[PDB]
Amino acid sequence: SDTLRKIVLEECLPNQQQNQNPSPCAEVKPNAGYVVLKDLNGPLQYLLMPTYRINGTESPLLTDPSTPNFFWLAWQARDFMSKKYGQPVPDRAVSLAINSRTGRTQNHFHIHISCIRPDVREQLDNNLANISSRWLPLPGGLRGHEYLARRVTESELVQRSPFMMLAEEVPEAREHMGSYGLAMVRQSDNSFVLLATQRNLLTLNRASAEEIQDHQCEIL
């Protein structure tokens, strides 16, 4: 359960600090609080994780305003996908996702930056007009699961993180952050859509937001 935490804190960070060599990570920014690591799964997938201990969506630190906006940092890190792709990856192809504890195996905060599934891309595009600033179930859900969705502008994202908005806006999400998985996708009008899904026995929802991603990048 601790391999990623050990890589970050015992390999990347010390190597960055000692030789300015982020290996095995792609980038290590101690002053900003994050690292970027190539994932072993998928040709373009990267992970964005903190340079200090935060275990996942359940961590209380995520609901503190001083905590770095990891989702926005992951968004910026989408360029690592383009570098591996060898050319610019269109924004519409990228998706960011974090899984809850029942939908993950590693206990160190990590956002999956990878390609969005084509069906999810279309499903989101078709509901542009239904996605507002208030969290509301996405019509049709995604992958057979209920997903609350919210429209957000880049300006809003720099002000607050998706976790802050989930906690401040959705009933009882504040006292059950760990039961949620969240994702971020950019919409056709250049705004973004935030997605939140909660663990649910009946629909077999493990709150694994990564399910909207296709690490084999067929959308490209």
Curated annotation (Swiss-Prot):
Catalysed reactions, as listed in the record: a CDP-1,2-diacyl-sn-glycerol + H2O = a 1,2-diacyl-sn-glycero-3-phosphate + CMP + 2 H(+)
Annotated Pfam families: CDH
Family as reported in the entry's similarity comment: Belongs to the Cdh family.
This protein's name: CDP-diacylglycerol pyrophosphatase
Keyword Lipid metabolism applies: yes
Any one of the GO CC terms: plasma membrane
Subcellular location: Cell inner membrane
GO BP term (any one): phospholipid biosynthetic process
Domain of life from the UniProt record: Bacteria
Membrane topology qualifier: Single-pass membrane protein
Pathway: Phospholipid metabolism; CDP-diacylglycerol degradation; phosphatidate from CDP-diacylglycerol: step 1/1
Enzyme class of the recorded protein, top EC level: hydrolase
Record's keyword terms, sorted: Cell inner membrane, Cell membrane, Hydrolase, Lipid biosynthesis, Lipid metabolism, Membrane, Phospholipid biosynthesis, Phospholipid metabolism, Transmembrane, Transmembrane helix
A single MF term (Gene Ontology): CDP-diacylglycerol diphosphatase activity
NCBIfam families per the UniProt record, alphabetical: cdh, PRK05471.1-5, PRK05471.1-6
Gene (name only): cdh
EC number(s) reported in the record: 3.6.1.26
